[PDB]
Write a protein that binds this ligand. Structure first.
Ligand SMILES: [Hg+2]
Ligand SMILES: [Hg+2]
Length: 238
């Protein structure tokens, strides 16, 4: 019931995405206004971009910026459940979401569902739940993927995820943020400059930054060293 603490001011980069999401935010902040105005918002937004680019974080920031609940679920989990259970769970998800107007329902790993009885049954239920939305339903469904081209076309038809928003690799601030988060718990030498590390890793995604630190940690750990140095980070980079 408590909206996330994360807001747009906490999201580095994604400047274009934020612009395109302004409309969703304003709707979530005052759904009654858009209803009375007879306006019409998507209700289905797909964030497109590579893994470790901050897609989930941004979606959470939308709920935070609008100070509205952020209800999460995983397409992966749904499909892992017994045949029919994933569908039943999809059903439970939207029934619960409807008791919290307005809100954001975020389906993680939509690829698992949109890309086998389990998957199909889960997908058909999601399709039905989305078509089941009335123009008055104060719900915005968000999802994320990097391969929108191999996604079941049905998920992109009008009334569903008919709004896509590109999310590129993190900018220098995004990378620094990712690096600082993953550096927690790792002993760094005084000469370690995470800000410089971010500047010198343009194009890197969350996974690369994570393996860079882990690989630096392993080197220092293997050589029996007590602290990770800037050189270790530079060596682990490639
Ligand atoms: Hg809702
Ligand atoms: Hg991360």
């Amino acid at each position: 019931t408590e909206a996330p603490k994360v807001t747009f001011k906490d999201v580095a980069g994604a400047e274009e995405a934020k612009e395109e999401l302004k409309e969703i935010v304003e709707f979530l902040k005052n759904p009654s206004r858009f209803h009375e105005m007879g306006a019409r918002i998507p209700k289905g937004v797909l964030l497109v971009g590579p893994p470790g680019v901050g897609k989930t974080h941004l979606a959470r920031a939308v709920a935070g910026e609008a100070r509205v609940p952020f209800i999460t679920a995983s397409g992966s989990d749904f499909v892992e459940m017994f045949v029919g259970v994933g569908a039943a769970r999809v059903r439970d998800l939207f029934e619960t979401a409807k008791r919290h107007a307005p809100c954001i329902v975020f389906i993680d790993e939509i690829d698992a569902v949109g890309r086998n009885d389990e998957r199909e049954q889960t997908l058909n239920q999601l399709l039905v739940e989305m078509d089941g939305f009335e123009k008055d339903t104060a719900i915005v469904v968000m999802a994320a993927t990097n391969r929108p081209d191999i996604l079941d076309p049905a998920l992109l038809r009008p009334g569903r995820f008919d709004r896509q928003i590109a999310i590129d690799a993190p900018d220098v601030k995004g990378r620094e943020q990712i690096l600082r988060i993953h550096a927690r718990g790792k002993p760094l030498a005084e000469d370690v400059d995470l800000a410089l590390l971010a500047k010198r890793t343009p194009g890197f995604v969350g996974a690369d930054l994570e393996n860079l630190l882990n690989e630096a940690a392993l080197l220092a750990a293997r050589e029996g060293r007590r602290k990770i140095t800037m050189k270790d980070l530079e060596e682990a980079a490639s």
